[PDB]
Structure formats: structure tokens, C-alpha cells
Design goal:
This is part of a larger assembly, with two copies of chain A (about 50 residues).
Chain A: H1 13-51
């Protein structure tokens, strides 16, 4: 079965919870990259203000 | 004689010019110190703003 998750989904529902979790993993990775981008740009803006 | 601006004077006029130069030098040095302190405090202000 699918131990641990919200029940031991078996077939179809298992194949759907797997897809949900995989899409969520990809989404979290995209979010981490996005956040790195944002904090880097904000840090550069702050450096510019400090130089000013 | 007293060699400088105004001539030799040679008397209480010499004393007057000497006292004028003395007071003026003290005034200049006090102004220099005032401006140095202003610069130092504004520098503290800007460094603290950068830290903020």
C-alpha cells in the first residue's frame, strides 16, 4: 500500500496521490529558485542604496 | 616694526592689530573644530543609516 500518507490508497488513487506529490515537489523547487532570485535582487537594491 | 597687513603701527595700534590677529586665529581654529565635529557626527549618522 501507500503507507504514511492520508490512507493506504491502492491503484488509481495511489497513482493520483503520486502525481500530486511529484507536482508539489516540482512546485517547491520552482519556489526555491524564485525566492533565491528575489532575495538576490533585493540585496543588490540594498547595496545600491548603501552606496548612495 | 610689525610687518604685515596695515603697516608697522608701532604702538597701541600694534597691540590692537596683534590682539585682532590673535582673536581671529582663535576664531578660525574654533570654526575648524566645529566643522570637523559636524562632519564626524554626520558620518556617524550615515554609517548608522547604512546599518539600518
Amino acid at each position: 500500500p501507500h503507507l504514511g500518507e492520508g490512507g493506504a490508497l491502492t491503484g488509481t488513487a495511489r497513482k493520483a496521490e503520486e502525481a500530486r506529490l511529484r507536482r508539489a515537489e516540482i512546485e517547491r523547487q520552482t519556489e526555491l529558485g524564485r525566492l533565491q532570485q528575489q532575495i538576490e535582487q533585493r540585496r543588490r537594491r540594498a547595496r545600491a542604496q548603501i552606496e548612495a
